[PDB]
Design a protein around this ligand. Structure first.
Ligand SMILES: Nc1ccc(CNC(=O)[C@@H]2CCCN2C(=O)[C@H](N)Cc2ccccc2)cn1
Ligand SMILES: [Ca+2]
Length: 223
């Protein structure tokens, strides 16, 4: 997260870290058994880390649970990042508590200008590299479809939206991918892609979760 702030320990209790010997992506707990993340975060052998603040220090509220299965969206296209969404099942159910909590799926898509919370452990610099150990947060509005498509002509599908600031300076970044964009209590986005981070007229692009609720519900009900 570039241009954000320290969230506060366990203030984003649906945020998870995907770990394969090291943190590599975020995700969102959507019920005690299931995490949603980005398809481009897929790999085998994921350990889901819940209840995290400092990902380099055991602070006492963590749950470490291996994934039993990963399901990439059937239409995920890594060339275009269309349908950049993936479900991960936990080998054992998470123990839900004030610090480990699920986030609701949207019943409907959200308006341009709606304020959202974006979070993750990714790079905090728009030029160069600095990774935080504690969770970082950003408040950012959904941008108009036309602003989004003007920034990224020929690249934005109906399954993507932009959020952030066309002036740059505040954005998601490498290492935030797969993590949440939450607006009015609903998981509206997944950190997906952009042109660098916090660049002018290049806001972050997010998977439009409202288009995937039927697939999420059907997939978890059969797996
Ligand atoms: N707002 C944002 C969000 C994320 C980022 C950092 N990530 C990227 O710039 C691109 C797009 C997302 C994936 N990625 C990578 O470079 C991958 N390491 C390889 C890959 C490339 C393309 C498709 C799949 C995989 C920057 N700004
Ligand atoms: Ca920790």
């Amino acid at each position: 997260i570039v241009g954000g702030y320290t969230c506060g320990a366990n203030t984003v209790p649906y945020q998870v870290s995907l770990n394969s010997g090291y943190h590599f992506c975020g995700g969102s707990l959507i019920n005690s058994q299931w995490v949603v993340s980005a398809a481009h975060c897929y790999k085998s052998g994921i350990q889901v880390r819940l209840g995290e603040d400092n990902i380099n220090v055991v602070e006492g509220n963590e749950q470490f649970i291996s994934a039993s299965k990963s399901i990439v969206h059937p239409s995920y296209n890594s060339n275009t990042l269309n349908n950049d969404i993936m479900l991960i099942k936990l080998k054992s159910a998470a123990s839900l508590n004030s610090r480990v909590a699920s986030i609701s799926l949207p019943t409907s898509c959200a308006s341009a200008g709606t304020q959202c919370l974006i979070s993750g452990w990714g790079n905090t610099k728009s030029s160069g590299t600095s990774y935080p150990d504690v969770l970082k947060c950003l408040k950012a509005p959904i941008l108009s479809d036309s602003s989004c498509k003007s920034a990224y002509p020929g690249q934005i599908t109906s399954n993507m939206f932009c959020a952030g600031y066309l002036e740059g300076g505040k954005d998601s970044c490498q290492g935030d991918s797969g993590g949440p964009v939450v607006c009015s209590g609903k998981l509206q986005g997944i950190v997906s892609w952009g042109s660098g981070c916090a660049q002018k007229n290049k806001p972050g692009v997010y998977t439009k979760v409202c288009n995937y609720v039927s697939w999420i519900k059907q997939t978890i009900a059969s797996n």
